[PDB]
Amino acid sequence: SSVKLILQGRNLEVSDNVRSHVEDKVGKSVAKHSHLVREVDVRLSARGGDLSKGPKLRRCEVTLFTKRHGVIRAEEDAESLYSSIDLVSSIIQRKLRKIKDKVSDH
Amino acid sequence: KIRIKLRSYWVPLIEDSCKQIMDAARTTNAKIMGPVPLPTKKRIYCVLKSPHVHKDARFHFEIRTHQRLIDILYPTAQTIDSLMQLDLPAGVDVEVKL
Amino acid sequence: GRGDRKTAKGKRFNHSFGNARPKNKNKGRGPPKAPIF
Amino acid sequence: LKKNPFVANHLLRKIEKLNKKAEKEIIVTWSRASTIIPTMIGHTIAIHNGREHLPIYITDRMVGHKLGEFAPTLNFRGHAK
Amino acid sequence: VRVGNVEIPNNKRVEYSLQYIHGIGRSRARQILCDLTLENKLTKELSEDELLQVRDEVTKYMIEGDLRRFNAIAIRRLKEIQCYRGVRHIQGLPCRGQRTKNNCRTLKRGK
Amino acid sequence: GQKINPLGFRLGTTQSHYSLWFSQPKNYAEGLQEDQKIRDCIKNYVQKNTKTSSGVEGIARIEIQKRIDLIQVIIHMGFPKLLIENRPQGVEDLKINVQKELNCVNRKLNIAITRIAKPYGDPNILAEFIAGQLKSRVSFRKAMKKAIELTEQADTKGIQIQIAGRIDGKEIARIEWIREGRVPLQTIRAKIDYCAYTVRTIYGVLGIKIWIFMGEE
Amino acid sequence: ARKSLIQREKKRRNLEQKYHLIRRSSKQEIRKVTSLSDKWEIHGKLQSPPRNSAPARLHRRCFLTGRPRANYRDFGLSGHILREMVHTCLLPGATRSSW
Amino acid sequence: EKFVKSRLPGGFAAQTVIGTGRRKCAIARVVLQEGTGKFIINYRDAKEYLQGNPLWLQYVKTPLATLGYETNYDVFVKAHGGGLSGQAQAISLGVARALLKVSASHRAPLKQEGLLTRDSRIVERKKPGLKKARKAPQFSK
Amino acid sequence: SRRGTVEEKTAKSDPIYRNRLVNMLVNRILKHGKKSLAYQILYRAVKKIQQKTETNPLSVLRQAIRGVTPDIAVKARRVGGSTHQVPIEIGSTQGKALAIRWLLGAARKRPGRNMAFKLSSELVDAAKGSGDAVRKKEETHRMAEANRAFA
RNA sequence: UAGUUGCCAACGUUGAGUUUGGAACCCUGAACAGACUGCCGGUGAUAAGCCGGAGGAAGGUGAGGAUGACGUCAAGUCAUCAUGCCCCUUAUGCCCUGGGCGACACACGUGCUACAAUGGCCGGGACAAAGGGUCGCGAUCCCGCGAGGGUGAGCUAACCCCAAAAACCCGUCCUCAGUUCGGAUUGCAGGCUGCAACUCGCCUGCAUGAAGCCGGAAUCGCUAGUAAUCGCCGGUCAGCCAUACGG
Ligand SMILES: [Mg+2]
Ligand SMILES: [Mg+2]
Ligand SMILES: [Mg+2]
Ligand SMILES: [Mg+2]
Ligand SMILES: [Mg+2]
Ligand SMILES: [Mg+2]
Ligand SMILES: [Mg+2]
Ligand SMILES: [Mg+2]
Ligand SMILES: [Mg+2]
Ligand SMILES: [Mg+2]
Ligand SMILES: [Mg+2]
Ligand SMILES: [Mg+2]
Ligand SMILES: [Mg+2]
Ligand SMILES: [Mg+2]
Ligand SMILES: [Mg+2]
Ligand SMILES: [Mg+2]
Ligand SMILES: [Mg+2]
Ligand SMILES: [Mg+2]
Ligand SMILES: [Mg+2]
Ligand SMILES: [Mg+2]
């Protein structure tokens, strides 16, 4: 809790039901190490189908800057928007847990 | 007392022409004060490489202008006929009177 | 300082002219300062 | 003061034209950079913003100013509404 | 009330003590002394006749009172007439072509 | 991942300018307009007079050399006789082609067409000999292979060829190149000629970058 | 860099030289005459010429591309296309720099 | 002043002992002469021209502090450009160069002490994309 | 750096006193790249110290560096174990410059009229045992003897 | 080697313009030489090289830069330009006026000016470089407190001008105060550019005199004429929001 959030309509408009789905996922992965991070960067995109040529694909780029010189870069691609958000959140929880295991190595 | 200024970009081109001014005039009886090279100017120019945001990537270039100054004394009819008759290179721009 | 336009340090930074940063000696310095014994 | 204020010819003619008659002949304009001479006092003039013309009555305390100061063209009421 | 319905300090110089008056800036403080051609001594040590000679000459300018009234009516002129610059005062926002996207904390704070 | 154009890299010592003239900075821009109006009309001239073959359709180089009351132009080609000797007025009509936009009676111009020693030693015609086959879609590697086998007659020491764009009609482009001998780009002392050429295919467009090592100097 | 804009600028180039000399006569006429005495007439018929004939309304473009930016009065071309002309041996004296 | 013009008949060009140093875009045309141990710059006193900065008075003297000739000669010089530090320390080389022409035997104390070494370091050029020759701009990662 | 061979700088001396310690003391005063002003801060100070103490200021300055110089410090290390701060000795040149920072550092902090007065009162007090820079010596020296064991 | 539009000296109307002598000084630009571990010692596999004298302006790549391999990110630009296919031809085209790109709860960045005494105001005195300039740069002189307004000497520029370099030195005052620090915001009165200055230009003269007392968690630059700090120039340009960019 007490962490800001940044969305970005790269190639589309950000709806409200989508915004609720974003906060639900990263809210789980970040609530664990909530006292290490201050902000959450997000950038949603869309391509293909009716917009462009090729398969419909929606990207979700997520960057995270902790309170102690921590940098995370996560980028995945899926056929739907929610599925893209889900896969990235799993990657953040993996690397975000990797940091504590190194700090708590003793 | 005909003060002649000539300017150009190329060093081996202007030196050749300056030698021809002496050759055309040395045959005629007339003293010449030696060539005095003035300080050369340099027009710096800056332009971008890309047509997009790439700002730090720049390309500088210059245009060096080598100018020289030669002056004659005690002109004669044989002298003035020798100067006009002389042929110059392409890259020279003579200034015969100031 | 440099932000104070009405001083010579500010006129030089902004490149303007007046009583603070005159052009030469004959320009106006309308109010002078009084002496101090 | 070395030069006179800006007043276009298409406007000056219409203003001067109505002083002979001295009656309301409500008119549209487009030059917002025109200065208000006191001859166009008591009249009503419509000033072209980005969208349309805004009829405004001229008051005696409008002389030195121009027409465009009274014709807003930004149209902002509140935020997030 | 030393002069001009304001209590000025008595330790500072004369030039840099009249400036606390609402109508006296940095140039007017010098013009008064230069007109009176007197030396810039202390405030307390000044004579009575010389200090008297200041009290008569300072009243010629818009020192106080009408100064604050001459301004407030001028800002009131733009509000009732509804100029562009007048509405910005009502909004608590500048009127001299400033950008309002990331600055103007002075007037936004002075709401 | 960007290599500098070797011509601009060697203007000082090795390479020379192909436009020798001078004017003041105020008139420097107008002189370039006169140059392009000349250089452009030659292409419009040689393009229309020729039947659009895969041979001498293009030229090698143009050299402008100005003087007071003269503009000495020198066109360079590999086979002038295909479009100069066939028409006796062809060389003359070129002067009328330029003289209309050039000036009135003053500031005349004479022009010459000099034969280069090796018509294919330069990269100019070597690119067009390739491009003539890509428009007829002979093949990709044959035009690249035949060009390398051709310049051996021109007594070249090294050569490099690059092609970029769409080749097999696929939805994706490719970049294929080849090098033979030695082609040092970072050596200012060496003499290297360079040319870039475009080929308008029925789909998209191609680009041909060529380097020719001729002398260590 | 549309074709209509390039011709649109040629329109202003011709109207300027058409109404060039009279403006200098008017800029001198407006400087001499007293205010409120024929001055509104002088400034009046200063508006009657076409606004397209003004010098300040001009805008230098690239000679080749017709680009409205990155122009150089000494060259007349945009910086990008002008760069390539330096490399491929068309400009006299334009060499790469290092000082 | 007329005093310096009286000692020099034709100026610093037509003289025997001479010194010509340069440092940091500055030039110093030095001419030694037998005198009483004074030091003048451009018809103006040293401390008046140097603003009493002690080190800038040192650098012009350390060529002369050695060899114990601080009283025999009077040194008259010129300056063309650069600031007072460059002009002063350029004169330090110029005054050193002229002592060689007096006698080439004592070249070693000037060399072992490191005075004739022309400090060839110059203000570095500003590069593109940077605020200075080396000051890079700030950017948030 | 990774080389380990740093060139030895040419330690110069002032014109008047002709000692290298004073020039090292001046180079820490300036912060905008001007030396003419530091001497107006220094030559007014050493004169002021002579005005008060009736003795040469050179010995008073040599005594202050002699007293404040700790010749020992503590540095953090975790190559073996977590959060260890074991002592470490200091050379002659390192301890010399290290004392100049503490003196000028305390002079700027303490009140006064000008840096010449703030610097004068610092050296005179620092030489006589009681000085703000001498307190930092005690604090740093305390951490060494406190963590005397290598842990 | 050459000696003016520069350098040295004589003359003084004068330092705006001139004349005379010198090529011996300095600078300007051609042409050469000079620096290569070349010479000596130590060490080294009898090697590469390494550590050191010396000499020399410079010694170990002399300093700085241009210079960017095969390739990576379907990275970037179809709005520099050129382009395949697709799409609009009484509109997705054509010409103009006005508006907008400058709006504003807020948030994220890059910079500028400051919180002062190593400082601030005033007065006097000094010291640069690189650039720009004939529809142009504009001296001197005369008006205005001023921005600017008249006259238009010279300069196609190593001549003349922009052009006062500023920090700094000397002297008076301010003595730790939201202040003689700081110069935001607003009113009044004016000027210049321009057909046009309200939204929406830059400046002058006055008067108002916000916040701010060196700054959390965090985080950036810099290894020598560097960082820090002072000012000058230029390009685009009628003018200029440039505290930028390049020097
Ligand atoms: Mg102030
Ligand atoms: Mg400004
Ligand atoms: Mg006056
Ligand atoms: Mg006041
Ligand atoms: Mg490659
Ligand atoms: Mg314009
Ligand atoms: Mg330089
Ligand atoms: Mg930048
Ligand atoms: Mg960036
Ligand atoms: Mg992509
Ligand atoms: Mg994109
Ligand atoms: Mg296109
Ligand atoms: Mg298209
Ligand atoms: Mg449209
Ligand atoms: Mg914008
Ligand atoms: Mg707006
Ligand atoms: Mg406060
Ligand atoms: Mg304080
Ligand atoms: Mg801060
Ligand atoms: Mg480094």
Distance C13 CA to ligand 2 centre (A): 8
Letter for the amino acid at F11? L
Shortest Cα distance, chain C CAs vs residue E37, angstroms: 8
D74's tokens: 């930004």
Resolution of the determined structure in angstroms stands at: 3.0
Maximum pairwise Cα distance, chain F: 56
Which single residue is written with the structure tokens 């050429």?
F197
Residues D32, D67 contacting (CB under 8 angstroms): yes
Q: Report the first-to-last Cα separation within chain D, whole angstroms.
A: 46
- Ranges of beta strands (E only) in I9-93 are 72-77, 84-89
**CA-CA-CA-CA torsion sign (B88, B89, B90, B91):** negative
Measured CA to CA in angstroms, residue I27 lies from H47, H60, I59 at distances of: 23, 21, 20
Strand partners, D28: D46
DSSP A47: B
F2 CA → ligand 5 middle, Å:
7
Residue among I109, I99, I111 at smallest CA distance from I136: I99
Beta-sheet strands, E only, within chain B:
3-8, 32-33, 41-42, 45-48, 58-72, 93-95
d(CA D49, CA A98): 61
Q: How far is F140 from F134, CA to CA, in rounded Å? A: 7
Q: How far apart are CA F126 and CA F122, in angstroms?
A: 7
Q: Cα separation of F125 and F122, whole Å?
A: 7
In angstroms, the CA F22 to CA F28 distance is 8
Q: What is the DSSP letter of H9?
A: S
- Is the Cβ atom of I32 within 7 Å of strand J at any atom? yes
Rounded CA separation E39/F154 (Å): 97
**J strand bases under 7 Å from protein CB:** 1-5, 7-10, 21-22, 24-31, 55-58, 62-74, 76-77, 79-85, 93-100, 102-115, 117-135, 140-142, 144-148, 150, 156-159, 163-170, 172-176, 179-192, 194-210, 217-229, 231-233, 235-238, 241, 243, 245-247
Other beta carbons within 10 Å of D58 = 17
Whether there are 3 or more C-beta pairs closer than 8 Å between I and H is yes
Residue G44 · residue D12 · CB < 8 Å: yes
- What b-and-e string marks burial along B58-78, b requiring 16 or more CB atoms within 10 Å of the CB? ebebbbbbbbbbbebeeeeee
The H or E element spanning position I104 is helix I92-109
Q: HEC states along chain F?
A: CCCCCHHHHCCCCCCCCCEECCCCHHHHHHHHHHHHHHHHHHHHHHHHHCCCCCCCCCCCEEEEEEECCEEEEEEEECCHHHCCCCCCCHHHHHHHHHHHHHCCCCCCCCEEEEECCCCCCCHHHHHHHHHHHHHCCCCCHHHHHHHHHHHCCCCCCEEEEEEEECCCCCCCCEEEEEEECCCCCCCCCCEEEEEEEEEECCCCEEEEEEEEEEECC
Nearest CA distance, G93 vs chain B (angstrom): 5
Kind of pairing, strands B58-72 and B93-95?
unpaired
**Deposited experimental method:** cryo-EM
Please state, in angstroms and rounded to a whole number, the distance separating the CA atoms of residues I23 and I68: 18
Q: Which phi and psi angles does A94 have, rounded to 5°?
A: -75, -50
- Rounded CA–C1' distance between F202 and J86, in angstroms: 15
Residue type, D49: N
User: Is the distance from CB of I104 to CB of I28 less than 8 angstroms?
Assistant: yes
Nucleotide J116's nearest residue (CA vs C1') is C1
Give the alpha-carbon dihedral of I138, I139, I145, I146, to 10 degrees: 140
What is d(CA I103, CA I68) in angstroms, rounded to the nearest whole number? Answer: 8
Q: Which two tokens stand for residue I120?
A: 């004068």
Number of H helices, E strands in chain E: 5, 0
Residue A30 contacts residue A37 (beta carbons within 8 Å):
yes
Give the C-alpha distances (Å, rounded to integers) separating B94 from B90, C22, G56: 11, 44, 37
Nearest to D27 by CA among D5, D55, D58: D55
The CA distance from G35 to G42, in Å, is 10
Distance CA F77, CA F56 (A): 8
- Residue in this structure with the two tokens 């840099």, named with its chain if needed: E16
**Residues pairing with F70 in the sheet:** F67
Query: Under the phi-then-psi rule, with left for phi > 0, alpha for psi from -120 to 50, and beta for the rest, what region is F55?
Result: alpha
Is strand J less than 7 A from the beta carbon of H14? Answer: yes
Question: Which 3 state secondary structure label does DSSP give E7?
Answer: coil
Q: How far apart are CA I71 and CA I96, in angstroms?
A: 9
Which residue of chain I has the CA closest to H58? I15
- φ and ψ of B44, to 5 deg: -70, 145
Query: Could you tell me which residues are beta bridge partners of residue F113?
Result: F75
Q: Nearest residue (Cα to C1') for J201?
A: E97
After what residue numbers is chain B broken, C–N > 2.5 angstroms?
none
Specify the amino acid at residue I2. R
